[PDB]
Ligand binder design. Structure first.
Ligand code: CLA
Ligand code: CLA
Ligand code: CLA
Ligand code: CLA
Ligand code: CLA
Ligand SMILES: CCCCCCCCCCCCCCCC(=O)OC[C@H](COP(=O)(O)OC[C@@H](O)CO)OC(=O)CCCCCCCCCCCCCCC
Lengths: 122, 51
């Protein structure tokens, strides 16, 4: 519904992107003469995977799961940009601004902390 | 006086203190086990079980 800050504060929901009903499987018509924008783009990570260092003999590295240690501080939101219609009919989103980066520290087995600038800048 | 090599014979007819001595020996062995593992965990590299 229309929640308020006071409904959300402290619950962890401020780090969650909005969602759509399971029945929203429709279609947004794109009018090439028109010009479009993304008014809000929200990205909520749910898993962080880090490529392990395959030792000298190697064979192949895997992406291993990690533990988040920096709490519900990870999402990107309020991102905006124009949605252009290219002449070949594709759409291209060009980010202008937004909260488009979060520092994140995850932890690997054994205890190695891995910080990263989770971002979609530009 | 007892010679040094016989001090522990004072337990031969003292079941209680014999048990106390055994308890202390068992304490020391379980402690060793715990200390040895912690040392090994502090020094073990788990990242290559092949080589
Ligand atoms: C399982 C071990 C153990 C147990 C349960 C006992 C039990 C007993 N001892 Mg025996 N004893 C032991 C080991 C042990 N002893 C060893 C190793 C020695 C040679 C030092 C002796 C020498 C000894 C004597 C000379 C006497 C006893 C006596 C006795 C009785 C009374 C307690 C006493 O005075 O202790 C005293 C003994 C100790 C406090 C031993 C301490 C040894 C320390 C903890 C070693 C630590 C070294 C170092 C800190 C290690 C760390 C690392 C290092 C690199 C820094 C009791 C039956 C007495 C008794 O009844 O005689 C009739 C007595 O007069 N004991
Ligand atoms: C569970 C096994 C066990 C037990 C309970 C005993 C118990 C006893 N022994 Mg026997 N003994 C054993 C094994 C055992 N012994 C073995 C394997 C040997 C062959 C080496 C002997 C040879 C032996 C002799 C020749 C004599 C005894 C005597 C005695 C009595 C007095 C010991 C004393 O006060 O020492 C006091 C000891 C000290 C004050 C210091 C000893 C420090 C030694 C040299 C090195 C320490 C090593 C380290 C701390 C711990 C052990 C490491 C590893 C084994 C776990 C006591 C009833 C004596 C006896 O009959 O008197 C009536 C005696 O004369 N023992
Ligand atoms: C009631 C039956 C019964 C049971 C279950 C035991 C059990 C045991 N006796 Mg024996 N004992 C019995 C009757 C019994 N005894 C009788 C009738 C006598 C004549 C007095 C003896 C005299 C005797 C002597 C002289 C010695 C034993 C020892 C031991 C222990 C050797 C193993 C050990 O320490 O493991 C390692 C220990 C653990 C893994 C932890 C044990 C935790 C248990 C569950 C006990 C919890 C607390 C409990 C209420 C205390 C009472 C214990 C029980 C023996 C009464 C073991 C627990 C030896 C001993 O005490 O070793 C130090 C020893 O020296 N017993
Ligand atoms: C099945 C395994 C087992 C057995 C049978 C024993 C038996 C014994 N241990 Mg125990 N112990 C064990 C495992 C075992 N232990 C383990 C795994 C640890 C942890 C590392 C210990 C730690 C421990 C300590 C800390 C002490 C004992 C002691 C004793 C003795 C107590 C009775 C006594 O007065 O002996 C009389 C002593 C003898 C008969 C001497 C026998 C000598 C043996 C064979 C060792 C040989 C000399 C040794 C290698 C020299 C060390 C040199 C080094 C410092 C450079 C007895 C011989 C106590 C002891 O020796 O008291 C004096 C003692 O203080 N033990
Ligand atoms: C609550 C009980 C308990 C449990 C679940 C464990 C569990 C463990 N211990 Mg600890 N431990 C305990 C009590 C316990 N311990 C106590 C009381 C002591 C002090 C004495 C220790 C001292 C100790 C040491 C010193 C070490 C461990 C180790 C270990 C690990 C390997 C065990 C192993 O290989 O045993 C193997 C046991 C045997 C092979 C025993 C064989 C028994 C012989 C054959 C006796 C036969 C005589 C019998 C009376 C005849 C039977 C008649 C038959 C007809 C039925 C495991 C995590 C090891 C480890 O990794 O530590 C970090 C190690 O090195 N433990
Ligand atoms: C946790 C670790 C703790 C470890 C504790 C330390 C270990 C305990 C100390 C053990 C040292 C033993 C000292 C006993 C020494 C000593 O007390 O001896 C003299 C002693 C005499 O005993 P008696 O029966 O006369 O009793 C006299 C009493 O006052 C002794 O308490 O005899 C014994 O000890 C028998 C064993 C003889 C040992 C003979 C050794 C002589 C070798 C000399 C030759 C050397 C080489 C030279 C030629 C190259």
């Amino acid at each position: 519904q229309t929640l308020t800050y006071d409904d959300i504060v402290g619950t962890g929901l401020a780090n969650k992107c909005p969602t759509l009903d399971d029945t929203a499987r429709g279609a947004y018509p794109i009018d090439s003469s028109q010009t479009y924008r993304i008014a809000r783009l929200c990205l909520q990570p749910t898993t962080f995977l880090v490529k392990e260092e395959p030792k000298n003999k190697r064979q192949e590295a895997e992406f291993v799961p990690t533990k988040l240690v920096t709490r519900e501080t990870t999402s990107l939101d309020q991102i905006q940009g124009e949605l252009k219609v290219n002449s070949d009919g594709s759409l291209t989103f060009v980010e202008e601004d937004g909260i488009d980066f979060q520092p994140v520290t995850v932890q690997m087995a054994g205890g190695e902390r891995i910080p990263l600038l989770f971002t979609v800048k530009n | 006086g007892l010679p040094w090599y016989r001090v522990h014979t004072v337990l031969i007819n003292d079941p209680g203190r014999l048990i106390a001595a055994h308890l202390m020996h068992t304490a020391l062995v379980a402690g060793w086990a715990g200390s040895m593992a912690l040392y090994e965990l502090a020094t073990f590299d788990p990242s290559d079980p092949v080589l």
